[PDB]
Amino acid sequence: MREWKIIDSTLREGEQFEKANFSTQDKVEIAKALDEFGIEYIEVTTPVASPQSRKDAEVLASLGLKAKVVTHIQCRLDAAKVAVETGVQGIDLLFGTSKGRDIPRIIEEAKEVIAYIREAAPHVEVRFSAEDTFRSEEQDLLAVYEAVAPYVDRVGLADTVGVATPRQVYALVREVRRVVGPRVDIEFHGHNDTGCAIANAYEAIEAGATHVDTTILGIGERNGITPLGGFLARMYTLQPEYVRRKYKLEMLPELDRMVARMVGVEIPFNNYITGETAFSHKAGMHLKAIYINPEAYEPYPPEVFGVKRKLIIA
Amino acid sequence: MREWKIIDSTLREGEQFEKANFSTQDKVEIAKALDEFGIEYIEVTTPVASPQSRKDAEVLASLGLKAKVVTHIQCRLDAAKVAVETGVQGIDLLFGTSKGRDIPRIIEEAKEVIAYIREAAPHVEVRFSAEDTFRSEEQDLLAVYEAVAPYVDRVGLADTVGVATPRQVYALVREVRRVVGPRVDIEFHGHNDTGCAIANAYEAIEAGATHVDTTILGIGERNGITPLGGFLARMYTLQPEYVRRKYKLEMLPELDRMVARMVGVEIPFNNYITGETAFSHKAGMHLKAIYINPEAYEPYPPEVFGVKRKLIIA
Ligand SMILES: O=C(O)CCC(=O)C(=O)O
Ligand SMILES: O=C(O)CCC(=O)C(=O)O
Ligand SMILES: [Mg+2]
Ligand SMILES: [Mg+2]
């Protein structure tokens, strides 16, 4: 069934955006606004990055938000300790691409970090991801995921370089689901270098993924990851009842403006839903249809997301 | 095999962009620049739109470009006459969604318009599309395409409202290929309302499509269609030899600037390849990899497209 949640990573992946320079107060404002919106998880930079990243994690995790606050660390004993001490509700392990590949060792090293966390904070949710998941040799990847999955709440896949294709993502998520079973959750994180972050997230869900990483406006390393708004536009057309129940969709314009303001960008003219142009109609044969029925050339209603259409009649 | 061509529609679909107001000279400049780039087709607004659309079609078709110039008309006898008289090298018929549906009639009406064109201009390439192809009842759609295909050079599919999913596009293109046979070309046109225009174009090609519609920066009705640059980024990662042979890729920045300048927009901060941020790296563990190998977190080389990476070390 198509049930899924969003992990916002504006305060993690989004910090890796070129122009991101979030004050503790910027982060709190973003987190509170995402919580009001209904977002299920808020992921934050590793506490090990700096004394300020640690403090921010500590504060965000203690905000009393309905959303779970989770932090993203390298899969190391070092960083695990720091992470649990911050009070986060979840820890997202990333086993980085080093790595040749000795698999029961990798399995041992992962299970150890995971074991410490269960010991030291049994109520913290643990996710395990290998970096560059879609480009790793698949037998070894599945071998590691299959062995680690009984010990974790979730496994993730990361299209780190933004080159995975929708059918590749669908296929690999299906194989992961087959080896981890129905209980373990499956998270997808995808970069947008080839314009496939939204499509891939969607195919990931169709294949059984339960969690999708987004950032507001898609901010992140390079051209960033799956954007919150474009993702909701995609999901809304397919599950409109579900999506409108889950989230305060009319808040999207303000989330996009807030982050645009803070990182010093303009909202792209063609940005999903909230871009200057998202609902503009011009062709005569289009306009003549919008008068009998606004739906005729509209994928979704603009009022649902708190915006309006423009007609260009001249 | 993965052979395909691009039909640029900046001078057709792109004219339907909210802020598009192209002078005859703007169009000539765009067309010449696309021709230098290596684009195979340039599609232009219907000559029936206004006396100026007719003139522009006439001029563009007579520029002596290597690219074929083709015009997009309603599937009517009226408009066909006007179209051949302009000297275009191709005519792209669109049978609009009216339509209930009486199929041998629709087939008769289409075959007639097509027959006139063969009579009056036997060297003109004819494409047939039904509007809103992915949402039409499939048996009737395939019935019409199958009957019309022996008489045309190409059939197209249009995701008019921008809601088709990548696996739906793949499937329907496969079914169309099955009924039209290996000779007739297959064109895909997709809107970006749900962030799937690039993904869909790519899946269309994997399924056997031979032609993809793009506009520079994706300008078009609403948030527009498959953007030239994001499409090339997608294809380049998969067929780098082929793509770099076909097109002058280092011209992409200037094509994007030219159109941004003319329609009065800024290039999106995260725009594929040419956006301010397309090649910016920040995370410490990313930067430490870019020094040993720039490829480690880069989908494609920036110099290939005439741009540079940015490192954010502080
Ligand atoms: O752990 C993850 O899923 C994401 C880490 C990341 O930014 C990437 O691999 O692209
Ligand atoms: O004829 C076509 O393929 C495209 C016409 C169009 O703009 C659409 O259906 O979205
Ligand atoms: Mg990432
Ligand atoms: Mg269109």
From Swiss-Prot, chains A, B:
Effect recorded for H72L: Significant decrease in sensitivity to lysine inhibition. Large decrease in affinity for 2-oxoglutarate. Almost no effect on affinity for acetyl-CoA and on turnover number
Instruction: Pinpoint the Pyruvate carboxyltransferase domain residues.
Output: 4-253
Temperature and thermostability = Optimum temperature is 60 degrees Celsius. Activity is rapidly lost above 70 degrees Celsius.
Keyword Nucleus recorded: no
Its cofactor is: Mg(2+); Mn(2+)
Task: Please state the Enzyme Commission number of this protein.
Answer: 2.3.3.14
Localization recorded for this chain is:
Cytoplasm
Gene3D superfamilies reported for this sequence: 1.10.238.260, Aldolase class I
Q: What happens when the gene is disrupted?
A: Cells lacking this gene show lysine auxotrophy, which can be complemented with alpha-aminoadipate but not with diaminopimelate.
This chain's protein is named Homocitrate synthase
Organism name: Thermus thermophilus (strain ATCC BAA-163 / DSM 7039 / HB27)
